[PDB]
Design a protein around this ligand. Sequence first.
Ligand SMILES: [Mg+2]
Ligand SMILES: [Mg+2]
Ligand SMILES: [Mg+2]
Ligand SMILES: [Mg+2]
Ligand SMILES: [Mg+2]
Ligand SMILES: [Mg+2]
Ligand SMILES: [Mg+2]
Ligand SMILES: [Mg+2]
Ligand SMILES: [Mg+2]
Ligand SMILES: [Mg+2]
Ligand SMILES: [Mg+2]
Ligand SMILES: [Mg+2]
Ligand SMILES: [Mg+2]
Ligand SMILES: [Mg+2]
Ligand SMILES: [Mg+2]
Ligand SMILES: [Mg+2]
Ligand SMILES: [Mg+2]
Ligand SMILES: [Mg+2]
Ligand SMILES: [Mg+2]
Ligand SMILES: [Mg+2]
Ligand SMILES: [Mg+2]
Ligand SMILES: [Mg+2]
Ligand SMILES: [Mg+2]
Ligand SMILES: [Mg+2]
Ligand SMILES: [Mg+2]
Ligand SMILES: [Mg+2]
Ligand SMILES: [Mg+2]
Ligand SMILES: [Mg+2]
Ligand SMILES: [Mg+2]
Ligand SMILES: [Mg+2]
Ligand SMILES: [Mg+2]
Ligand SMILES: [Mg+2]
Ligand SMILES: [Mg+2]
Ligand SMILES: [Mg+2]
Ligand SMILES: [Mg+2]
Ligand SMILES: [Mg+2]
Ligand SMILES: [Mg+2]
Ligand SMILES: [Mg+2]
Ligand SMILES: [Mg+2]
Ligand SMILES: [Mg+2]
Ligand SMILES: [Mg+2]
Ligand SMILES: [Mg+2]
Ligand SMILES: [Mg+2]
Ligand SMILES: [Mg+2]
Ligand SMILES: [Mg+2]
Ligand SMILES: [Mg+2]
Ligand SMILES: [Mg+2]
Ligand SMILES: [Mg+2]
Ligand SMILES: [Mg+2]
Ligand SMILES: [Mg+2]
Ligand SMILES: [Mg+2]
Ligand SMILES: [Mg+2]
Ligand SMILES: [Mg+2]
Ligand SMILES: [Mg+2]
Ligand SMILES: [Mg+2]
Ligand SMILES: [Mg+2]
Ligand SMILES: [Mg+2]
Ligand SMILES: [Mg+2]
Ligand SMILES: [Mg+2]
Ligand SMILES: [Mg+2]
Ligand SMILES: [Mg+2]
Ligand SMILES: [Mg+2]
Ligand SMILES: [Mg+2]
Ligand SMILES: [Mg+2]
Ligand SMILES: [Mg+2]
Ligand SMILES: [Mg+2]
Ligand SMILES: [Mg+2]
Ligand SMILES: [Mg+2]
Ligand SMILES: [Mg+2]
Ligand SMILES: [Mg+2]
Ligand SMILES: [Mg+2]
Lengths: 110, 195, 117, 134, 59
Amino acid sequence: PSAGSHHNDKLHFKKGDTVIVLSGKHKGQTGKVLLALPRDQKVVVEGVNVITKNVKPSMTNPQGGQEQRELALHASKVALVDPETGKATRVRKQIVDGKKVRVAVASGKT
Amino acid sequence: MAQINVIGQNGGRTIELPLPEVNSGVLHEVVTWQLASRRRGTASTRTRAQVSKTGRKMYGQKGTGNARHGDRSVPTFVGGGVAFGPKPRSYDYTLPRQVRQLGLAMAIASRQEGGKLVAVDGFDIADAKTKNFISWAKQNGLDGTEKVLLVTDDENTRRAARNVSWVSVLPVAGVNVYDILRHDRLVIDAAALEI
Amino acid sequence: PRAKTGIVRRRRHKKVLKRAKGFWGSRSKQYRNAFQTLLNAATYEYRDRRNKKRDFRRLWIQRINAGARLHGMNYSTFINGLKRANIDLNRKVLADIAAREPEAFKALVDASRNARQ
Amino acid sequence: GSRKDRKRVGRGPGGTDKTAGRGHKGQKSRSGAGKGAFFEGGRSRLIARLPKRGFNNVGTTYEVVKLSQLQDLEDTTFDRDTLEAYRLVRRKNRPVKLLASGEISRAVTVHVDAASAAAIKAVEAAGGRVVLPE
Amino acid sequence: THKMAKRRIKITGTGKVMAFKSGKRHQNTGKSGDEIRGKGKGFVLAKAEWARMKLMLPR
RNA sequence: CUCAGAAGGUGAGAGUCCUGUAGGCGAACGAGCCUGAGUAGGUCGUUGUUCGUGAAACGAUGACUGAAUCCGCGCGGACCACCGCGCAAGGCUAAAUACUCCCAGUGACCGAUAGCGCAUAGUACCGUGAGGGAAAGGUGAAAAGAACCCCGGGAGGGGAGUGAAAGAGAACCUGAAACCGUGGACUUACAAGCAGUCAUGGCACCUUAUGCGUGUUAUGGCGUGCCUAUUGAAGCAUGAGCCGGCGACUUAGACCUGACGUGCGAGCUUAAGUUGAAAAACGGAGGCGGAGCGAAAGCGAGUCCGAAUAG
RNA sequence: GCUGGAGAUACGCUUUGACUCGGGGAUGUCCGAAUGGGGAAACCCACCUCGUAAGAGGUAUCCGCAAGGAUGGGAACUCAGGGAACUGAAACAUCUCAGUACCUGAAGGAGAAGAAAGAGAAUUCGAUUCCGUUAGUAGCGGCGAGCGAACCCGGAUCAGCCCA
Ligand SMILES: [Mg+2]
Ligand SMILES: [Mg+2]
Ligand SMILES: [Mg+2]
Ligand SMILES: [Mg+2]
Ligand SMILES: [Mg+2]
Ligand SMILES: [Mg+2]
Ligand SMILES: [Mg+2]
Ligand SMILES: [Mg+2]
Ligand SMILES: [Mg+2]
Ligand SMILES: [Mg+2]
Ligand SMILES: [Mg+2]
Ligand SMILES: [Mg+2]
Ligand SMILES: [Mg+2]
Ligand SMILES: [Mg+2]
Ligand SMILES: [Mg+2]
Ligand SMILES: [Mg+2]
Ligand SMILES: [Mg+2]
Ligand SMILES: [Mg+2]
Ligand SMILES: [Mg+2]
Ligand SMILES: [Mg+2]
Ligand SMILES: [Mg+2]
Ligand SMILES: [Mg+2]
Ligand SMILES: [Mg+2]
Ligand SMILES: [Mg+2]
Ligand SMILES: [Mg+2]
Ligand SMILES: [Mg+2]
Ligand SMILES: [Mg+2]
Ligand SMILES: [Mg+2]
Ligand SMILES: [Mg+2]
Ligand SMILES: [Mg+2]
Ligand SMILES: [Mg+2]
Ligand SMILES: [Mg+2]
Ligand SMILES: [Mg+2]
Ligand SMILES: [Mg+2]
Ligand SMILES: [Mg+2]
Ligand SMILES: [Mg+2]
Ligand SMILES: [Mg+2]
Ligand SMILES: [Mg+2]
Ligand SMILES: [Mg+2]
Ligand SMILES: [Mg+2]
Ligand SMILES: [Mg+2]
Ligand SMILES: [Mg+2]
Ligand SMILES: [Mg+2]
Ligand SMILES: [Mg+2]
Ligand SMILES: [Mg+2]
Ligand SMILES: [Mg+2]
Ligand SMILES: [Mg+2]
Ligand SMILES: [Mg+2]
Ligand SMILES: [Mg+2]
Ligand SMILES: [Mg+2]
Ligand SMILES: [Mg+2]
Ligand SMILES: [Mg+2]
Ligand SMILES: [Mg+2]
Ligand SMILES: [Mg+2]
Ligand SMILES: [Mg+2]
Ligand SMILES: [Mg+2]
Ligand SMILES: [Mg+2]
Ligand SMILES: [Mg+2]
Ligand SMILES: [Mg+2]
Ligand SMILES: [Mg+2]
Ligand SMILES: [Mg+2]
Ligand SMILES: [Mg+2]
Ligand SMILES: [Mg+2]
Ligand SMILES: [Mg+2]
Ligand SMILES: [Mg+2]
Ligand SMILES: [Mg+2]
Ligand SMILES: [Mg+2]
Ligand SMILES: [Mg+2]
Ligand SMILES: [Mg+2]
Ligand SMILES: [Mg+2]
Ligand SMILES: [Mg+2]
């Protein structure tokens, strides 16, 4: 049944990266990446979020009520923008350390 | 019969133009065949009980109170086999060469009655870069509001190709009636082998 | 390439069904019994068309002598004396004048009366 | 313009769809159906009734060269032994014989496998000759 | 067909079909009249429509 | 920007957002004097190839016999002579050929009665067994999948809320028809009917629409379902409960024969294949006209029957 | 980042490089050619050897001196032993269906075939297989239904090597 496997299930950005909402609601809001799920997409960022009425049945308290929690997202938003912009940064480079690769566009690192 | 090239006239263009202006009948005979030949024959159909899966016999003929039919693999049955379905055909044949020759003659002549372009020394492409192709065409009156068919040698000059639209490369005279007729205009570039 | 029957039959059927309106019971609602009855209707339409002509003729006539006999004549006599006078080519829908215009039809009667006998 | 490309004006019709009112319900009426036996039929066919034994054989058969072809039209150019192309013999692998059809007085030299004596009459009587292999 | 091959039903220049003559053939002749030596080549094209496709490579 | 414009994903249709694509690179470990004897040859029983015992050659064996050695031997369709072609009774051998469990790519192939039987199942179910054998789909862009209140044991629904939409709420895309109902309009309880049709009146309506109107209805005239099968069908002769969907004149071949159309036309055309494919050229082996008559030899604008000419 | 589809709470594991790979290994219970012996598959009962129990190894036939080889399983394809009938002939015996279906055996990724006691009628060709063509031609046949070559030529591929 397909499902998000269209991209090569390689993820741009990373676990902690700061990033901008591309399209969608908000759009240009930012947040540190909370959860990255390569298979299914599903970026968790500090941005747009929905009020979740929690399931009435519970072992602890009758409770329910409504948590705020999170709204997960696709590759629908941007990736790790350095140069004071919402730029989509293609290039990698072997620069700085001879180990890591730092994606930049008009600029360096990220 | 009348053309000025990119390097300046090649000694002149004459060739010939099978008057009256082309012909639509003989043309359409060609392209019909053309597409017909290139057509890939393929079909999925299940015939009857050999090709479907049923086997055996059914409730028995007389005295069941219901209809006669002896098997479930037959066309009159849902989930059954199919009668007169498509099979893996061919659709190919040999159009008489006389007409195949005559076809694109007419078709080349169809571009001559209208806008027609031939070139030598199109070297302005400057390797490939695809951009100088856009310039070379632009300097030559090719807007991009027309779809062009580039036919030539010198693969570098072809290696700049395939624009947002309108640009189609057709190497070293594999030219056919279809492609040149479907396009807005044609650039045969090199007049060599177009002798 | 298969081409299924889709969206063709349904439109045609409904096209028939809609012709059937005041049709009683199954006649209106289900196609097969609706389609035929139109078969028979064809017979009733085409034929009744040239018949209403017949009907009306006998209706006009039926009026004419009703008026004629009121004056002591009859359709046969009246139509003849009116014919026996080239004067009145009146003929068609003479009944209108018979029913609606009594004083008129009378003068029309005596003309027939006179130019006959 | 590809879309402007027209028909042939009566190159050909569509086939026959036998499913409809107006022209359907076809074949014969009875016993004309589900078929595949047919051809010629009966009691005792004419063929079997008719006599023969005869032969088959068909040995040597000759490529004909019409005499009018050489003389008069063209140059009467002395077709020689193998003219072949530009001349009328094609399939060959069979001997060639020269027969009298058309005639004029002009010289000729013909190499053939055989010829009619009444043709070979007119070959020399116009001047020239017909030669045969040893 | 192979039937009319050494048999009758010969085609001609015009395409017409040639029939031999039957009665009598190799037996039961006797009698008198010429007629014995009078069974020759003959034809009709009425039936012959159906005899063309039976053997046409040759005449 | 383009050596990259193929393609799929992203809240709706992106060349420049993502994955990609053109192009470039890439591994330790991997994987590509002789020369054939119980035989050739034969007789009997048979069979193979076009070979049906036929004038039956030759191969091949079941049963009986049973040779020559090169101043030899087998074949050339009974057999003989001449003339030729070939050396049996020892074996092995890549390549061009076939098929598709399996992987890839493409499609004037299907799109949930289609396509494989299965949008997974040889499962459910049937059979002691061999064996046979199903139907199958869709919330949303995202679960944000409905905390909370109300009636009810529940089921189920009414709110609130989320969402563009709950006219998507989990018996979740569209949702036709048969079939069941609710409300309204005009109608119906002395009337004999294939259910209609025609004419007029009555009531109601007014978005192709105030007329040649739509809907309904009363009254009058007319009026023997449909199909098949038949000399003849409303037939008390066949078929059908109704609606949906499935469902029947096709494809093949260097085939045959006609018509129309086209290109070359005293000529016309290639097949297998080779090469090149974002496309086609190449390929004369062969085929069809071109001469007929005869049983055939054969002869030839002639031929055939025959001594001629009569045909 | 991960902690199979599994969707669900928990315990967690991971830059000392997880997970997902690509490629070698290592363990691989019992049944099944099953093969220690038995046996209504996947369970019962044994003998020998190394030994501290735990446990590991062996114990079927067939070719051979031995190394070693063979049993069994394959969708269709190949070759071989065996070999139908319906049907057609407008009935039916020869004939056709057809050496098709099925059965059995063997084998491989292919197989079969092959290096002229040949084809043939030019004193020509030149192992085999395959395609086109010859050609519905020669012929076969209750001379019925119907069956139906090869040689020349054009192609695909082209190798001949060894023993008595
Ligand atoms: Mg019943
Ligand atoms: Mg199916
Ligand atoms: Mg489709
Ligand atoms: Mg009527
Ligand atoms: Mg009248
Ligand atoms: Mg009147
Ligand atoms: Mg058709
Ligand atoms: Mg018609
Ligand atoms: Mg019938
Ligand atoms: Mg009859
Ligand atoms: Mg019948
Ligand atoms: Mg049948
Ligand atoms: Mg036949
Ligand atoms: Mg003849
Ligand atoms: Mg896209
Ligand atoms: Mg834009
Ligand atoms: Mg020897
Ligand atoms: Mg022998
Ligand atoms: Mg014998
Ligand atoms: Mg016999
Ligand atoms: Mg023999
Ligand atoms: Mg001797
Ligand atoms: Mg002999
Ligand atoms: Mg001989
Ligand atoms: Mg091989
Ligand atoms: Mg299905
Ligand atoms: Mg369904
Ligand atoms: Mg099944
Ligand atoms: Mg089963
Ligand atoms: Mg049971
Ligand atoms: Mg979903
Ligand atoms: Mg519910
Ligand atoms: Mg509830
Ligand atoms: Mg609702
Ligand atoms: Mg809805
Ligand atoms: Mg529920
Ligand atoms: Mg939707
Ligand atoms: Mg729905
Ligand atoms: Mg009420
Ligand atoms: Mg009601
Ligand atoms: Mg009463
Ligand atoms: Mg009443
Ligand atoms: Mg009544
Ligand atoms: Mg009236
Ligand atoms: Mg109103
Ligand atoms: Mg009435
Ligand atoms: Mg019917
Ligand atoms: Mg009767
Ligand atoms: Mg009657
Ligand atoms: Mg009845
Ligand atoms: Mg009956
Ligand atoms: Mg009944
Ligand atoms: Mg055929
Ligand atoms: Mg042909
Ligand atoms: Mg063939
Ligand atoms: Mg023609
Ligand atoms: Mg011409
Ligand atoms: Mg999951
Ligand atoms: Mg990874
Ligand atoms: Mg055991
Ligand atoms: Mg055992
Ligand atoms: Mg063992
Ligand atoms: Mg097997
Ligand atoms: Mg029988
Ligand atoms: Mg029979
Ligand atoms: Mg038999
Ligand atoms: Mg087998
Ligand atoms: Mg084996
Ligand atoms: Mg062949
Ligand atoms: Mg050859
Ligand atoms: Mg060779």
